[PDB]
Design a protein around this ligand. Structure first.
Ligand code: FUC
Ligand code: FUC
Ligand code: FUL
Ligand code: FUL
Ligand code: FUL
Ligand code: FUL
Lengths: 343, 344
């Protein structure tokens, strides 16, 4: 078997106090510690997830009744271990996916489905040849329709913005405040609706001290926000998602504990205390959160990432509870391996 | 600060019972969880270590009184996250470093210093265009001088060999026995001397059950050896090294515990029980061991790898003890970060 810390739970079926003996799955055609991007339709009707296969291609898992796997970018397009982040607007007929080339330049994949189209193509961002820090992660927001903002870590470790809109094409945007940890995970959200202008932008990142911090944009410019987590694991995965709950934006910020369990902090008329959503240890690796608002005004959340041993998980927050069934989405060949908890 | 499990020690200056509050270093120009290859001179006079920088270049740290950093392969030569493994012979004037291209093909960097030369160049292996599983690690041995063997994982997850020698150039060698874990770390050693022929080859790897296993070559062919560890962490780093002690090969096999501490098992007239060499938790990431026989007949070992938060460590076994002070080798810009031990 493989050994796992006996104090940690590797799966939903682990013993109550930690792993004793169980079987877990290794999906070896998923890149180990793959990046993840995702977007659930604002209607909740379908889901998109993007990830990197072991062979370096970028793939898509689309849910509509069942999951269907496809390849969106061939090997050679993306850095091995590229970050990923996605946009969806229209409300839901226009998709963009951002990634890094093997030369650490921003790249964009486009999927247009407006009016029944189905056009996939390389975006104009590629031609700007924007070089980023080689360990940069990526975030992005959209507003007013097709006004786009892409966030990355520059070579001097500051967070930086690139902009699209107004007929200008892609142009350098702001340099953000704060002192980001080199290689920090980042996640940016727009609290205002996809068609509204101005946006209300929040970004979450880890600082050089290890704390988690918040970027805030409102008209007038960028500032460091009130969200402060004094300590978090080194290079903790971070992902945030926002949707309106009872007509007020509900921000959900997710990161990992030292036990590699998922911690959530919610902003909704103020920040609520961080709380662990479940006690199952995920692989310490990129996660991706997405959300939508039901007709009753409540907000569903989905989180994707890597579960032990190497499987794509889906965690579901629905009707106000985290569901005990955590799903796995197969992306290729798999082997089952016995796991034993060791002290 | 950053949070770290309070039951684990992040450094040699951590509190006796774990991490409480301390400062640790982040070298952000070292690729996070870089691969490592290494070779100490058989005289012990100098040391070579290779690693991947954040920009994807492959660099070298050479010790002779002090460490000197130099770049050997520019960005674009190597897969981001490439494995690395090295050969040294002549006894100590000819170096080969194996890595993967961004298209998952075996590559070879050559450094020839015989006759006072200083030639660095791409090896003939590159032209064979040997595609490997994208998660493959790499091992290699040399014997009889320039008879080379390179070990990798093929697309069906078997371990495979490529050979060089006999005027035949590079050719496909054996397919090895056993059922290797996809992406297993691998480490191959020659129990016989660099200028002896035939070799006596051992390779250490993790199987689909999670156990650790051993490949054996002796005249007659390949077989699965007697070294078995029934359970080990998933995708545990593995590195082995051999040097003679009292005229018999001393194999040292290193892997990680679930606490990410380094475990050693020695073979020398039989296998000895595995034992933890120190109680400091490394980053669970590639390690690289090397060894030489000291003038008093004892065997020195050096291990390189990633220590918290992201620095290149050197662990030293010398005069029969693992030295308590674990060094770091700077490879670029660094920042200090406070670390606090936290409970569940
Ligand atoms: C909204 C715009 O759509 C296409 O024109 C892309 O080429 C641009 O880069 C941008 O994504
Ligand atoms: C020993 C041999 O040295 C050089 O000729 C290389 O090009 C070969 O690939 C091999 O390493
Ligand atoms: C919404 C704002 O649009 C402006 O053009 C940018 O300069 C700001 O940084 C921000 O993205
Ligand atoms: C919605 C709130 O906006 C403010 O500007 C921030 O300081 C808070 O942390 C939060 O994001
Ligand atoms: C030492 C032996 O040399 C032979 O040529 C190879 O076929 C074997 O696999 C092994 O490497
Ligand atoms: C040196 C010994 O040779 C034998 O063949 C192997 O079975 C042992 O595990 C060990 O390597």
């Amino acid at each position: 078997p493989v050994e796992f810390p006996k104090s940690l739970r590797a799966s939903s079926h682990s013993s109550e106090g930690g792993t004793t003996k169980e079987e877990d799955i290794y999906g070896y055609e998923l890149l180990y510690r793959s990046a993840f991007a995702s977007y659930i339709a604002p209607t909740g009707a379908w889901n998109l997830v993007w990830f990197q296969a072991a062979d370096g291609s970028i793939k898509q898992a689309r849910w509509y009744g069942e999951w269907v796997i496809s390849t969106v970018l061939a090997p050679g397009k993306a850095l091995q271990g590229t970050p990923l982040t996605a946009l969806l607007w229209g409300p839901q007929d226009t998709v963009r996916l951002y990634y890094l080339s093997p030369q650490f330049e921003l790249q964009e994949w486009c999927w247009d489905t407006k009016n029944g189209a189905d056009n996939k193509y390389d975006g104009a961002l590629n031609a700007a040849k924007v070089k980023v820090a080689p360990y940069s992660k990526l975030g992005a927001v959209s507003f007013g329709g097709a006004n786009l903002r892409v966030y990355y870590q520059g070579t001097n470790n500051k967070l930086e913005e690139y902009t699209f809109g107004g007929g200008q094409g892609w142009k350098k945007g702001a340099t953000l405040p704060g002192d980001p940890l080199p290689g920090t995970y980042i996640s940016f959200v727009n609290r205002n609706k996809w068609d509204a202008n101005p946006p209300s932008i929040r970004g979450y990142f880890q600082t050089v001290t290890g704390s988690l911090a918040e970027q805030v944009w409102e008209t007038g410019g960028w500032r460091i926000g009130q969200f402060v987590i004094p300590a978090a694991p080194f290079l903790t995965p971070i992902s945030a998602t926002v949707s309106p709950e009872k007509d007020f934006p509900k921000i959900h910020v997710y990161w990992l504990s030292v036990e590699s369990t998922i911690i959530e902090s919610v902003n909704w008329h103020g920040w609520k205390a961080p709380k662990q959503i479940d006690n199952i240890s995920v692989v310490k690796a990129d996660i991706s959160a997405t959300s939508f608002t039901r007709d009753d005004g409540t907000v569903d959340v989905r989180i994707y990432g890597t579960a032990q041993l190497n499987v794509l998980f889906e965690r579901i927050f629905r009707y106000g509870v985290w569901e005990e069934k955590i799903h796995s989405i197969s992306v290729g060949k798999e082997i089952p391996i016995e796991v034993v908890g060791v002290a």
